[PDB]
């Protein structure tokens, strides 16, 4: 009888909720009450990268924190030198519908995917001075939402078919398949040690998965709508999620709870991208109101706004050394702030 | 110019890449874009065959005009998470089967999907081209089956005329943005041939009315 199983599952989730409640002795705000606030953060547009002709949907900084790859619906994947305004590369995609991009940590490969259900990996450091499609990973049923590199041979993707996957690049087969989500997975992030990863879906819940074993370690549910972004804290024991209800939430791995919520009454639109900064003191989040907000991670106050875009901000990133913050919006312009 | 030889060569390479990007964009800005939106295999494959994986693209030419048609009916995902990618499309094409009224009713689902697409917040200026089809088998069924099954509130003759017009008006009344949007209805069929000309005329009418709308007139 399925009713008995449903009742027993209800009992188990009630037990989990009670166990979580038992360990909540003090809130994050109470401990961080006595600390010096960061103050007012003023950032200036050092560079403006132009040349795209459509909506920019994703970007990813390089490991050297100097080169960056950007993807747009124009059908071009542009690799820029960020110190100057030069264009290192301009790759024409086979399918113009691209919604994600990635840059390999070694700096040799670049991956992109979208509505074609196929993740294309291009090799940049080749002979002949040309960029060609190294691999085309297929096997997904829904649109590809994100893709991240572990090394030069392994990749992790998530799709709208409520499924994530770990692929081996050399042989284009799904090495591991992660299932359990009841909604379209929209974002993922890798741990600094590349052993665990969290994924947010449209079922208003995030899940923490183990790469090697392939089973879901943990689940978290505190939101009210679709989750569009996720990112680990630099320490690696916490992460932050952004949803369509204009709220960011900081979950912690060890406490298995949510610690802090960032929201404000004047802001009501959704959130497209969330990323921390070096040392994890600041949290930058883009919004649908054409702006980007900086929150103090320890407290709940707001530090500043990065308002220099004329359309919805679709992606943003912070360098590995924290010197600059790049933002890309639905108008074809990339802006570097420092 | 406080630059080395290699930096100057890199600047030259970037300037050459800019020219190619601009030339590709200018060429890509001269094409007409159509988004095909059916409902439960309601004659979608019939019309794509008459014009000479998740998303399918069909490129063709007619009277010195390049048409690119996107079929996204095989996505089987949440529509609201990727529909905004199709903002700015020149026109939307809707296929409705007239023979499934006897066949949860399929016509009601088609009407609901048409209402959802037409009154969407992204396609507030794009025009919809209707392709009410399967007229022959519709007549064959209406000969021996009344239309009252779908529409209880209907008093009309049980013939092809006065019945297909009722369906056309019912589908057209679902529009709520008549101020900046128009619907072009056509009664095609499996053996019909002049569908491409109808699409061409609708597209050129849309182009003229958009050019005269940008300039401040109209």
């Amino acid at each position: 009888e399925l009713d008995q199983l449903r009742q027993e599952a209800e009992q188990l989730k009630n037990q989990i909720r009670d166990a979580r409640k038992a360990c909540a002795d003090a809130t994050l705000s109470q401990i961080t009450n006595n600390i010096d606030p960061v103050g007012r953060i003023q950032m200036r547009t050092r560079r403006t990268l132009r040349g795209h002709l459509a909506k920019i949907y994703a970007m990813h900084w390089g490991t050297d924190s100097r080169l960056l790859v950007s993807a747009s619906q124009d059908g071009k994947l542009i690799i820029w030198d960020s110190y100057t305004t030069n264009k290192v590369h301009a790759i024409p995609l086979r399918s113009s519908w691209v919604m994600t991009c990635a840059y390999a940590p070694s700096g040799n490969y670049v991956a992109c995917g979208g509505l074609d259900n196929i993740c294309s990996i291009y090799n940049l450091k080749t002979r002949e001075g040309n960029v060609r499609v190294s691999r085309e990973l297929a096997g997904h049923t829904g649109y590809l939402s994100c893709c991240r590199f572990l090394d030069d041979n392994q990749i992790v993707t998530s799709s709208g078919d409520t499924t994530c996957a770990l692929w081996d690049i050399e042989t284009g087969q799904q090495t591991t398949t992660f299932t359990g989500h009841t909604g379209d997975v929209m974002s993922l992030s890798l741990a600094p040690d590349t052993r665990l990863f969290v994924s947010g879906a449209c079922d208003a819940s995030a899940k923490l998965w183990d790469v090697r074993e392939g089973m879901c370690r943990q689940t978290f549910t505190g939101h009210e709508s679709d989750i569009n972004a996720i990112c680990f804290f630099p320490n690696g024991n916490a992460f932050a999620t952004g949803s369509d209800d204009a709220t960011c939430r900081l979950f912690d791995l060890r406490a298995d709870q949510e610690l802090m919520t960032y929201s404000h009454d004047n802001i009501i639109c959704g959130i497209t991208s969330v990323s921390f900064s070096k040392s994890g003191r600041l949290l930058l989040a883009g919004y649908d109101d054409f702006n980007c907000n900086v929150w103090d991670a320890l407290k709940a106050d707001r530090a500043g706004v990065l308002a220099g875009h004329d359309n919805r901000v679709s992606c943003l990133g912070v360098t590995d050394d924290g010197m600059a913050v790049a933002t890309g919006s639905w108008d074809s312009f990339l802006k570097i702030w420092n | 110019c406080t630059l080395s030889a290699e930096d100057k060569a890199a600047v030259e390479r970037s300037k050459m890449i800019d020219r190619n990007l601009r030339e590709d964009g200018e060429k890509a800005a001269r094409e007409v874009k159509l988004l095909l939106l059916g409902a439960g295999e309601s004659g979608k494959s019939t019309i794509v065959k008459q014009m000479k994986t998740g998303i399918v693209e069909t490129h063709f030419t007619f009277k010195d005009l390049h048409f690119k048609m996107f079929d996204v009916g095989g996505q089987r995902s949440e529509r609201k998470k990727w529909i905004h990618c199709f903002e700015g499309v020149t026109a939307i094409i809707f296929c409705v089967a007239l023979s499934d009224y006897d066949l949860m009713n399929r016509m009601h689902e088609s009407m609901k999907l048409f209402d959802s697409i037409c009154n969407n917040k992204w396609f507030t200026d794009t025009s919809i081209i209707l392709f009410l089809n399967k007229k022959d088998l519709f007549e064959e069924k209406i000969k021996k089956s009344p239309l009252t099954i779908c529409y209880p509130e209907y008093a009309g003759s049980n013939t092809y005329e006065e019945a297909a017009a009722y369906i056309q008006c019912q589908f057209e009344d679902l529009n709520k943005r008549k101020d900046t949007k128009e619907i072009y209805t056509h009664f095609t069929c499996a053996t019909d041939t002049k569908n491409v000309q109808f699409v061409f005329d609708a597209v050129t009418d849309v182009i003229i009315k958009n050019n005269l709308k940008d300039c401040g007139l109209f």
């Epitope: 290192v88 002949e128 001075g129 | 050459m16």
Partner: single-chain antibody, 231 residues
Framework: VQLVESGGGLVQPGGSRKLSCSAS????????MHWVRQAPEKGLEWVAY????????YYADTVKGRFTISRDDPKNTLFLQMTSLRSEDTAMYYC??????????????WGQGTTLTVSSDIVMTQATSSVPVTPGESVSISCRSS???????????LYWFLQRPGQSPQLLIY???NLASGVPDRFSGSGSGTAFTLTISRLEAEDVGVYYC?????????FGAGTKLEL
């Protein structure tokens, strides 16, 4: 990836000639090209350079005015037109490729060369001429400039080429302390702004040849005297 050169031969003084360089196996339309000549016994010497798209063309002062460079992209060919040949123009000519962007490796591939026989610049100096050494030891080669090769952006433009007896020059280290692809890690290079050194840890039987140090800070490009290695 291969380059084949045609032309050369015996030319009477005061005449004219044309040299062709055909590239097959790579994207010839996105690579800048160089013509470099070498005397029968002396060191290498730069001749001319043409950018991608023929936007910029640079000539050496020795043959400035009476030489012409050109390229054809659909046929993937490079042409050199030499006019009013003198007795000093006899040389082996090489057709080198070089692509310029961030992190690129200019002068990575060299042509085969064609022989021709006629009937205010930075001075790069290699004092050493020949070093006799046995295989298995570590060898250091010193190249001294006459100006600060270090630039305001932090890059040091110093290229090291190895030419084996009977073979075209091969790139080893393109910029200062930047090993090229396809060569063993046992080669290394360092410098101190004006004087630079090349170090080989475990010398083998394939390291016999001539080493050249070249500067790319500004045109005209200047080579150095040969530093032969003998067993």
């Amino acid at each position: 990836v291969q380059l084949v050169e045609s032309g050369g031969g015996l030319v009477q003084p005061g005449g004219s000639r044309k040299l062709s360089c055909s590239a097959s196996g790579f994207a010839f339309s996105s690579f800048g090209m160089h013509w470099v000549r070498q005397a029968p016994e002396k060191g290498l010497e730069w001749v001319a350079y043409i950018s991608s798209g023929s936007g910029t063309i640079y000539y050496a002062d020795t043959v400035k005015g009476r030489f012409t460079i050109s390229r054809d992209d659909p046929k993937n060919t490079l042409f050199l037109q030499m006019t009013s040949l003198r007795s000093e123009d006899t040389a082996m000519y090489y057709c080198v490729r070089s692509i310029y962007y961030y992190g690129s490796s200019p002068f990575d591939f060299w042509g085969q060369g064609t022989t021709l026989t006629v009937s205010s610049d930075i001075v790069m100096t290699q004092a050493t001429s020949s070093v006799p050494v046995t295989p298995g030891e570590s060898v250091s080669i010193s190249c001294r400039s006459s100006k600060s090769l270090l630039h305001s952006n932090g890059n040091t433009y110093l290229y090291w080429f190895l030419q084996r007896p009977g073979q075209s020059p091969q790139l080893l280290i393109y910029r200062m302390s930047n090993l090229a692809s396809g060569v063993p890690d046992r080669f290394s290079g360092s410098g101190s702004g004006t004087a630079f050194t090349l170090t080989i840890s475990r010398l083998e039987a394939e390291d016999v040849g001539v080493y050249y140090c070249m500067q790319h800070l500004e045109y005209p490009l200047t080579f150095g005297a040969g530093t032969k290695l003998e067993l």
